[PDB]
């Protein structure tokens, strides 16, 4: 709706312009998930006794 | 642009554009061109004359 009005001329592109299936979009999905402890976690670790 | 900066007039660049009318771009040899020219086609004061 304002893509010509200001973006057109000053040479920015749609960006998907040119692709057949609309683009892939993810969400945060706020369903709690076990996830392995990371290694570089600030507040937690886990040491293999 | 290239002329202005080697120091030409209004009257080089303009008799410089007329033997170089050929050089502008084709818009089946590049995919931008391809939608640019169908949104300048688009305008309801564009008149190919």
Known sequence: ?49 | KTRYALKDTDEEVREFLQNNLHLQGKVEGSPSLRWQMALYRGLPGREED
């Open chain 1, 1 to 49: 709706r304002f893509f010509a009005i200001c973006g057109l001329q000053e040479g920015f592109e749609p960006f998907a312009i040119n692709m057949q299936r609309p683009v892939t979009t993810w969400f945060s999905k706020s369903l709690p998930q076990f996830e392995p402890v990371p290694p570089e976690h600030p507040h937690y670790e886990v040491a293999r006794m």
